Design a protein around this ligand. Structure first.
Ligand SMILES: [Cl-]
Ligand SMILES: [Cl-]
Lengths: 639, 639
């Protein structure tokens, strides 16, 4: 260290995934969020794609069929289905495919006592009786292998019972879209299904054959960083691990391994990419994706990896997660929303109200990935550029009281992020062509503390009217994946020049600090295109992060400057072909033809054919040898 | 990228923690593992310290008292207590303070049916009855607020029952040592208690006031990387989250946040160090510590951080974890060991038999930390050097079938690790003064697959008689913390020149690949001091890592070469004082005076006093301003 020398620039060459707004690739999810602001062709295309995903129309030979068989144009689909599509996307009341928020199962303790008046007696299979038999219970032989049991003392049974959750809303994938139906997903937790399906969307969005990418780098130069913050807590993962015996049965052979928080990452190496490269799963509570992204940037700038898949997968819409967050007072409850609305019949579509009158966050599911390459490899392959990522800063809070309360670290991350952007694009561009993807979690603490940080950093850097957007208004809070939802939305702003409004609020709460911020409940189109986005995130445990994302225009200027006009022109030619391939994928995806990659048990490396020498390793299936890298770090310390 | 320029060297300036061998700092745990090979003063000192930890003797005014009050010398302690100390440390049968492995609670499903012969009737409190009331049940009023219930149809109750686990053994902290008693640990999961207590041991082992360290760096230049792979699954964490309602009660306000796998890290920032610096928790299954260590090395070499606390905390000795791993066939069972021994009364102290006849790993608890500094800061502060860490390589397995089966990535990590060491210390030193801390998990698959990798890398680099040691023989497999147990043991080999034997095996299994390896069941002392250790690790999910650790001698030669004789002499003088301070801590720790740091609710930063400008941030409580770092990475892409 001291300072970093000239380095590879991380460019975003693909992105994809799924959240409550739909499919992320090609900006479809973004378009759903700003659907009314899009032109009709873009809107109708996205609506048609949602209709297919949701099984509202049948994709038949490039056309669309109603339940009647009636052929529909995209214009007809908007007329006929827009209301249903809108009602069955974004934050909304929790639907039965997850749970019934008025009837979740638990066990009550039922204390049964006998007394002088009536016997407490039953017949039972002896194999179902407690072991050892409770000493006070009577047992006698009965017919058909059963025994006659009588109880003489108070004891505790557990009985099935049903209760209502105080929280009724969540950010849910579009109703009817089922990731598990898209590949051989038997026994996989929902978070793993979502990771597999999202990863394929991201990889195919590049318009480049994965084989071509692998053939162009060393085997160790591919990296994947993903994971969840909860672990996979459904029945097929740690839910089964922790609950099976309390429900009367054994733990399965797969519940423990498939529950690990690294499995969204591990499944991508094992079944999607077939990578022998770098891997890891980094958590930082609700800033987790930016923690993974920091690692991704660092491995590119240090030269360790040239292709990086960075993302997360979280599927936390489960009664235990909801109760766990509720127990902290963290979530928007029905009663909380009743107070804000001043009526009993709440609009759960407005449960998430960043910077407005609000009362806690809304839990959501999402899996999102970006594909990064170094600039030189992107240039070589004709990879498209959706943006560039230059830094992520992470700072804890110092000493704390409550571990989950907000703290000062986010001052440091935002300040450092802005300063870093000034060095790269200049003060004027930061002042007049940057925006903030606010953490915007929809809590009274966040709206005050986050706005105060942004306002004070704005003042320090001489920014006024700093545009702020809050993706959680649309898709809720997907925990690990939250800042990936932010990043991907940001890319849509670069594409279409629209800053999504916070449409769920009627006005900004009176206690929000606004002097230097522009927070709107309407979509906005800036005269001067936005060139830089600051992604802001935080979580429990003194976790804070801010990321810097540059637009395609800025990134292209940078590649042109470094590589020159001849090399850039050659890149442009190759990129016309990769753009055509990507568009063809988007067209298939619109039709529901997603071709999920799940390569279980295929193309396994024969380890006995790995060749190791003192100069390199040859790995079966990889055309490029892994040549050990010459080290200059400590050369002055030697001899 | 392309290649890294001259860089800061990560040096190990402190280390500490707790596992089945005892306190890690000052090599006490190491000494327990090679206790019979130590000289009597070192052995008796460690035994006395264990005796105090285990409450077998009372530390009274620098002396030691038996239950009788009889004063004891360390020589007397060895005579009187060695047998008990040995029996109550290391891998052994699971003790009651964890669970009874012949009587773990669960619920059986008890199907109660009535028939023509006897009524099924009981009185109950109506508040304990299912909601809604099962439609077929009869209810009538009764005395004292209770109701009379009768059942007419088969239904399912859950009843308490007790079962035996097939696994009876684990690596357990020394019997009598209780981390929770050492600080205000109310409502903390065991893994968090262990993290807090281990972190203090590591920090105090440096012999430098934490304040002095903080005063010498910028606020963002401190980093902490830790975590667990399971999450905290005990009652106070995700166990309570996932089980409360199945046991009849509500989830608490703390079970969810304190269960997160990042909390071992978050607690250190919040309550131990008061850091506003970098943070993160990286998982890679049973290679996790090396994944955290890779991040630690990278932040030092890139200049992002100057002081890094790297470690892990795992406390997985819980019925659900044991059953979950057993369900995979991963653990050594009593029946498995009976087959190896050919008798029914198994020696559970030999449950873990790396490279011998064996039958699965042994689950263990451990929390371990190392304190890293860049070489320049270490020089400035007179920090001691226990070793240096130059690289960690991580490689996945490519396409897989079973996600938990072994794969080829570890070929790549070991090969790259060895090549990297050759560049730094030369081929001769690698060939004749290096050793391997084998993953050595005690499974039939591992003993073959790992030995084949090591043998084939040895052949490639012309190594013969490559010494191999396996720490899991002593302390079992602590999951996230496993490779920290390895690293810390390695430091002991550097200190004392002893390579611990695999004492639990009688000979190496016939299928182990040994041509170029030296695997012994006895402690060994090499004529030529060992200078380099390769730490090898792997886990489920296609996770593999290998780390390179250099001895103090090598690291000192390197610092002398870079910084020169005058600067090194000044360092030596300061280091005499820091060594004296560290020794004084070790003396207090021997007496049970550990002074655990837990600074809840104290010294909180007043966020309104944070000052942000376009040049720097001033943070209350930190003498050094955070000055934004000048970036040269992309300068050629600008203007
Ligand atoms: Cl908010
Ligand atoms: Cl083994």
């Amino acid at each position: 260290a001291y300072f970093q020398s000239m380095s590879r620039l991380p460019v975003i060459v693909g992105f994809g995934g799924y959240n409550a707004a739909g499919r992320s690739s090609f900006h479809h999810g973004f378009r759903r969020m700003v659907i009314e602001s899009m032109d009709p062709q873009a809107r109708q295309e996205t609506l048609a794609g949602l209709a297919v995903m949701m099984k509202l129309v049948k994709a038949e030979g490039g056309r669309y069929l109603a339940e009647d068989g009636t052929p529909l144009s995209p214009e007809d689909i908007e007329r006929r289905y827009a209301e249903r599509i809108f009602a069955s996307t974004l934050v909304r009341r929790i639907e039965p495919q997850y749970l019934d928020p008025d009837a979740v199962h638990w066990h009550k303790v039922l204390e049964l006592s006998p007394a002088e008046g009536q016997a407490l007696t039953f017949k039972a299979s002896p194999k179902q009786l407690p072991e050892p038999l409770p000493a006070n219970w009577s047992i006698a032989p009965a017919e058909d292998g059963e025994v006659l049991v009588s109880i003489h003392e108070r004891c505790e049974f557990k009985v099935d019972s049903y209760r209502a959750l105080t929280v009724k809303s969540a950010g849910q994938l579009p109703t009817g879209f089922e990731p598990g139906e898209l590949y051989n997903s038997r026994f996989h937790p929902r978070g793993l299904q979502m990771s597999v399906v999202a990863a394929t969307d991201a990889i195919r969005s590049t318009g480049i054959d994965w084989k071509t990418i692998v053939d162009n780098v060393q085997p160790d130069e591919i990296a994947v960083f993903s994971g969840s913050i909860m672990s996979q807590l459904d029945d097929n993962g740690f839910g089964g691990l922790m609950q099976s015996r309390l429900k009367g049965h054994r733990v399965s052979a797969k519940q423990l391994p498939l529950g690990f928080n690294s499995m969204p990452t591990d499944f991508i190496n094992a079944y999607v990419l077939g990578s022998v490269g770098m891997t890891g799963s980094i958590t930082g509570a609700c800033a987790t994706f930016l923690y993974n992204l920091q690692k991704g940037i660092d491995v590119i700038t240090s030269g360790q990896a040239r292709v990086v898949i960075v993302g997360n997968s979280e599927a936390p819409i489960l009664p235990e997660c909801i109760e766990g967050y509720s127990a902290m007072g963290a979530l928007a409850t029905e009663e909380g929303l009743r107070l804000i609305e001043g009526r009993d019949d709440v609009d759960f579509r407005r449960a998430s109200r960043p910077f407005g009158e609000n009362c806690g966050f809304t839990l959501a599911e999402s899996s999102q990935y970006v594909v990064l390459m170094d600039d030189e490899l992107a240039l070589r392959l004709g990879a498209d550029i959706h943006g560039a990522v230059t830094d992520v800063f992470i700072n804890a809070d110092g000493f704390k009281k409550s571990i989950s309360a907000p703290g000062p670290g986010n001052y440091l991350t935002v300040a450092k992020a802005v300063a870093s952007a000034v060095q790269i694009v200049g003060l004027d561009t930061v002042r007049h062509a940057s925006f903030v993807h606010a953490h915007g979690s929809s809590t009274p603490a966040n709206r005050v503390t986050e706005s105060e940080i942004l306002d004070r950093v704005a003042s320090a850097f001489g920014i006024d009217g700093w545009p702020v957007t809050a993706v959680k208004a649309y898709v809720g809070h997907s925990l690990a994946t939250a800042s990936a939802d932010q990043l991907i939305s940001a890319l849509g702003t670069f594409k279409y020049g629209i800053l999504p409004g916070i449409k769920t609020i009627d006005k900004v709460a009176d206690d929000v600090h606004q002097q230097r911020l522009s927070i709107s409940n309407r979509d906005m189109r800036q005269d001067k295109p936005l060139e830089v986005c600051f992604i802001n995130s935080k979580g429990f445990g003194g976790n804070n992060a801010s990321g810097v994302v540059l637009s395609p225009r800025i990134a292209e200027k940078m590649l042109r400057k470094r590589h020159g006009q001849a090399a850039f022109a050659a890149y442009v030619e190759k990129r016309e072909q990769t753009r055509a391939a990507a568009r063809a994928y988007d067209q298939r995806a619109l039709q529901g033809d997603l071709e999920i990659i799940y390569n279980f048990g295929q193309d396994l490396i024969d380890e006995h054919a790995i060749e190791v020498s003192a100069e390199q390793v040859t790995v079966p299936g990889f055309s490029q040898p892994l040549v050990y890298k010459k080290d200059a770090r400590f050369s002055d310390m030697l001899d």
